[PDB]
Structures are given as structure tokens and as C-alpha cells.
Write a protein that binds this ligand. Sequence first.
Ligand SMILES: [Zn+2]
Ligand SMILES: [Zn+2]
Ligand SMILES: [Zn+2]
Ligand SMILES: [Zn+2]
Ligand SMILES: [Zn+2]
Length: 139
Amino acid sequence: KPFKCSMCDYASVEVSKLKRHIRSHTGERPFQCSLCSYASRDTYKLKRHMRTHSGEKPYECYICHARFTQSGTMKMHILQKHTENVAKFHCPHCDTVIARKSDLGVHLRKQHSYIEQGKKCRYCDAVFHERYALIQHQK
DNA sequence: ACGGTTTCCGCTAGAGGGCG
DNA sequence: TCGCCCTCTAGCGGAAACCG
Ligand SMILES: [Zn+2]
Ligand SMILES: [Zn+2]
Ligand SMILES: [Zn+2]
Ligand SMILES: [Zn+2]
Ligand SMILES: [Zn+2]
């Protein structure tokens, strides 16, 4: 409506939007950096990748003047540093509270995901394949 | 106190959406 | 239209902070 994707269920109004989405399915990265071996699927992510080469920090916190490469990083810094009563991330499986969303993801794969490279309990010889079960068992 | 682990914090880079 | 630019999202890795 008008342009449905055919593999996944994406659809959007513009032909360029559906073709860019299909580049996400195929893996085509048309726009090559003229400086290194990076290549992007659209023009914007290449322009933004060029800031790493130039080393520019075009965003500045209007409160403490720290500088940042991207706006989202600046916004988040303002949120964690110059703002109170902000919602935190409580893990569903344990009692852990984390300030940032992706750190919660890091926590979930690192403490609550299966690893066949299991660890032995420090005090007995039983082995566990998820760290939280291990540390809880180690009572 | 001391090493390991957990959380912080700026970083790169991945998607989709609005509009002139 | 579609090229431009925007936010939101996902993870990385060094540093700091926390703990048994
Ligand atoms: Zn698709
Ligand atoms: Zn490059
Ligand atoms: Zn600031
Ligand atoms: Zn947890
Ligand atoms: Zn045991």
C-alpha cells in the first residue's frame, strides 16, 4: 500500500523507501567511502560516517558544553546528567536496575542467555549454562 | 585491600519516516 | 519523486564503580 515488500511485511508510500528496504534485505551497500572500506546502503549513513574521518563533534550540550559526534548521544547525555526522576530499566528476570536501554540488552544476553561453554560452581562440581542460574545456585 | 564483575558513557552504525 | 535530513534503535569497548 502501495508498495508491499514480498519477504517480510514492510510496505511504504514511496518506491525509493521500498527499494532502500530491499537493500536492507539483500545487503547491497551502494555508497562507498572514498577513504576506507566502509559502504552504506543509503547516502545519509555515509555522510554521517564521514564525521569519524574528519573528527568533527557538531553537537554541544547547552548546559555543560561537552561535545558529541551525534545528536542522539547528546540528548541521552542531557537525560542522564541534567535530568532527574527519569525512568530506569528493570530486568524482568533479576533485581537489576539499569539506566540505559541497550545496556539492558547487554545484561540480558550476558546473564540470561544460554552458553554451552558452561561454568562450574565455585563451591561444588555442578555446572550451569546461564550465569544468573549459576550465581543464584552458588547461594 | 584486591581482582573480578557490573554498570556507565561516548562511540559507530543499523532501521524507518517527513518533506520541499 | 526522491534526495536530504531527522529520530529511534542496537551494540561495542574502555572506564569507573561496586562487591565479596
Ligand atoms: Zn522486506
Ligand atoms: Zn571511511
Ligand atoms: Zn551536559
Ligand atoms: Zn536480569
Ligand atoms: Zn554448588
